[PDB]
Structure formats: C-alpha cells, structure tokens
C-alpha cells in the first residue's frame, strides 16, 4: 500500500485538514490522488520543492 511519489502537484484544505495532490511515479494524471499530510511523512523533499514553487509565483 506504499508507492513512490514523482512530485506534489497542488494542495488544498477540506473539512479543516490539509491534502496534497500526488503524481505517482510511473503513472499518469489519470492516477493522481489527494493524500493527507499523514501519508507524506517520507516526502519532505518533494513537499518543500512544491512549497518553493508556490512562494516563487508570488
């Protein structure tokens, strides 16, 4: 039930919790999912890459 992450695509809140849209390595946009922060504790690298792209377009 664990899969390799290619990159983080976007973020959103829903019902007061943060979710991140995940592009899964070896898959296409047809397989993207929204995942809670809890599931991404091993993804600190790609999350800070994402948050840096947000900060720069601002």
């Amino acid at each position: 039930d664990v899969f390799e992450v290619e990159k983080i695509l976007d973020m959103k809140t829903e019902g007061g919790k943060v979710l991140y849209k995940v592009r899964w390595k070896g898959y296409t946009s047809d397989d993207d999912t929204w995942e809670p922060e809890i599931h991404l504790e091993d993804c600190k690298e790609v999350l800070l890459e994402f948050r840096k792209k947000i900060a720069e377009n601002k």
């Binding site: 039930d1 899969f3 995942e35 599931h39």
Partner: peptide, 5 residues
C-alpha cells in the same frame, strides 16, 4: 514514498 488512499 507515500501511502495511497
């Protein structure tokens, strides 16, 4: 690596 739900 992440869990997929």
């Amino acid at each position: 690596f992440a869990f997929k739900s």
